[PDB]
Ligand binder design. Structure first.
Ligand SMILES: [Ca+2]
Ligand SMILES: [Ca+2]
Ligand SMILES: [Ca+2]
Ligand SMILES: [Cl-]
Length: 581
């Protein structure tokens, strides 16, 4: 490859970062780092307070973007999501929350961390005390905008007007807009809700979004009734949105953009139509859920950033249907289409349960079912090639593919899918306004050391020396390398024998060639990617090292506590990451 300048590295099982020859890594920032001057130091005993966590780097860092600093090449801002927390490490008791303060502490761990970084020499470093440093967390005051703002379903006892919401939490991945703002995506928000009525009978929309009385081992509701569906059921509707943040204004109020629909959002991939409108491609990460596309009403003003303030409040929401393809076992291909989710179109009307457009957005999953969207194998990140505009989406896995309602076919070609695949599409005429596209599976992950000559062996661009499972994160660099980040089974055994720890790979989109670039430490997933403007530093997240015990990364103190960290990857020779030497 012209694009792949390093030799594929072996799989690894060590509690370290493994890289190719001539590459190094350094910790940029870890969970618990105080952001402000004189801020409270990280307390490895777990006795840090909730109020301290509200001014410290959050836990389980995930999606992130870097923003150039106008007029200053040695400064940048990064906005970094904090998805969830690890109770075994968060609290001194190592278990479920025991109090209102424990719940506040968990909420404080989630949201976004905005930080300044500076280069000074050739190395990017965190600037504690920068005026731009900020936490947005699960108890931060936010606003709601777009077509669902002010709707009855968005009103609660504490917010009678349906326009002011506390918190963004379960922040998964990201988008970066061409008007200088950051998008953060609320994914597994429903996990945080429960009920003080164990026999609560949930309605169809509540059931479709997966809420339970017990919560998914989160257990905030016994201590903060905002999360108790017996008392505040509409709170459930005020989360599951894309949230827009201005990193250059630390006093700004983030805004939930209801025009982009409510679902378990993974990331938000930006593009632009030929007539100049914003496009946002979005995955809903759950087994058998859908892929969406928002197109703005108005054109992007590239030279007047502020003129775009509310561009994401007006537009059209679509969902994808994919055909069955040609059935090729190695490289299936076909066509697909975008179908509009608008009240009064495609069977979405009072006769299918929708009174108005706000309900369509709040209950986007149900509207998408009405129109016949294709059930997918867990869409996670989406990226748009900066070289040719093709769109790439991980389908991480789907253990229930083949069950009633989830038939095998097209871009989901295997029952009981434990490995995943990467889907690509090319919008017709290379115009992102097009309502049709050609799709293909760019790779089908598998294990050819265990399942050679079968569907479980993967596509022919997978070999025993580059194999991986559960691709999740994706990123393009300016050169057009496609970076693939994994969140899979790290047992290195059975179906996953020889795959080792979670990892990052690099692909050439034009040829399908994939090489392993990085292996992470024990119990982590590899997630979050950004580049310095000069492409000589690759920032990558190591999330939940030691989730099951067994890590002390990065500090490696005796019987130590592991900490989610953002790493800076560089070449010893100072060249571009991924490129030839
Ligand atoms: Ca993910
Ligand atoms: Ca994942
Ligand atoms: Ca994960
Ligand atoms: Cl572990």
């Amino acid at each position: 490859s012209r694009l792949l300048g390093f030799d594929s590295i072996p799989a690894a099982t060590t509690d370290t970062i493994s890289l190719p020859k001539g590459y190094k890594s350094s910790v940029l920032i870890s969970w618990g780092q105080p952001l402000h001057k004189n801020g409270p130091a990280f307390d490895p005993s777990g006795n840090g307070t909730a109020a301290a966590q509200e001014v410290q780097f959050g836990d389980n860092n995930d999606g992130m973007s870097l923003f150039e600093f106008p007029g200053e090449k040695n400064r940048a801002l990064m906005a970094i999501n904090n998805e969830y927390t690890n109770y075994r490490y968060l609290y001194p008791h190592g278990g479920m929350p025991q109090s209102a303060e424990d719940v506040r502490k968990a909420l404080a761990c989630e949201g976004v961390s905005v930080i300044e970084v500076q280069r000074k020499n050739g190395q990017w470093q965190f600037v504690q005390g920068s005026r731009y440093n900020r936490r947005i967390h699960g108890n931060s005051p936010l606003r709601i905008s777009g077509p669902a703002a002010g709707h009855e379903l968005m009103k609660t006892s504490a917010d009678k007007h349906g326009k002011k919401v506390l918190g963004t939490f379960q922040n998964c991945a990201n988008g970066k807009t061409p008007w200088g703002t950051y998008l953060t995506c609320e994914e597994n928000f429903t996990d945080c809700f429960g009920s003080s009525n164990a026999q609560q009978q949930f309605d169809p929309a509540q059931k479709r979004y997966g809420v339970s009385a017990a919560s998914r081992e989160i257990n905030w509701h016994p201590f903060d009734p905002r999360f108790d569906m017996a008392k505040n059921p509409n709170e459930l509707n005020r989360h599951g949105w894309v949230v827009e943040i201005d990193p250059f204004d630390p006093q700004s109020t983030p805004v939930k953009r209801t025009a982009l629909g409510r679902f378990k959002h993974e990331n938000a991939a930006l593009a632009e139509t030929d007539d100049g409108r914003a496009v946002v491609y979005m995955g809903d990460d759950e087994r058998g859920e859908f892929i969406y596309k928002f197109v703005s009403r108005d054109k992007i003003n590239h030279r007047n950033a502020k003129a775009n303030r509310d561009i994401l409040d007006h537009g059209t929401l679509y969902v994808a249907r994919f055909d069955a393809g040609d059935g090729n076992p190695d490289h299936p291909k076909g066509q697909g289409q975008w179908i509009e989710l608008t009240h009064g179109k495609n069977g979405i009307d009072a006769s299918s349960g929708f009174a108005d457009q706000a309900e369509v957005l709040i209950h986007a999953r149900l509207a998408a079912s009405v129109v016949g969207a294709t059930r997918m194998d867990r869409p996670e990140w989406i990226v748009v090639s900066p070289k040719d505009g093709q769109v790439y989406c991980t389908l991480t896995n789907n253990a229930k593919r083949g069950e009633d309602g989830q038939p095998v076919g097209g871009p989901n070609p295997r029952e009981k899918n434990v490995y995943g695949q990467i889907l690509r599409w090319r919008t017709d005429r290379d115009d992102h306004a097009s309502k049709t596209f050609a799709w293909d599976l760019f790779v089908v992950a598998g294990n050819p050391s265990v399942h050679a000559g079968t569907p479980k062996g993967g596509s022919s661009n997978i070999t025993p020396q580059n194999m991986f499972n559960s691709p999740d994160g994706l990123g393009f660099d300016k050169a057009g390398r496609l970076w693939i980040l994994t969140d899979g089974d790290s047992s290195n055994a059975g179906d996953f024998a020889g795959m080792g720890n979670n990892q990052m790979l690099c692909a050439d989109p034009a040829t399908g060639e994939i090489r392993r670039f990085m292996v992470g430490p024990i119990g982590c997933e590899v997630t979050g990617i950004s580049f310095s403007p000069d492409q000589k530093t690759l920032f990558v997240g190591i999330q939940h090292p030691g989730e099951n015990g067994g890590s002390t990364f990065p500090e490696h103190l005796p019987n130590g506590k592991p900490r989610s960290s953002v790493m800076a990857i560089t070449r010893e020779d100072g060249g571009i990451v991924g490129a030839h030497h």
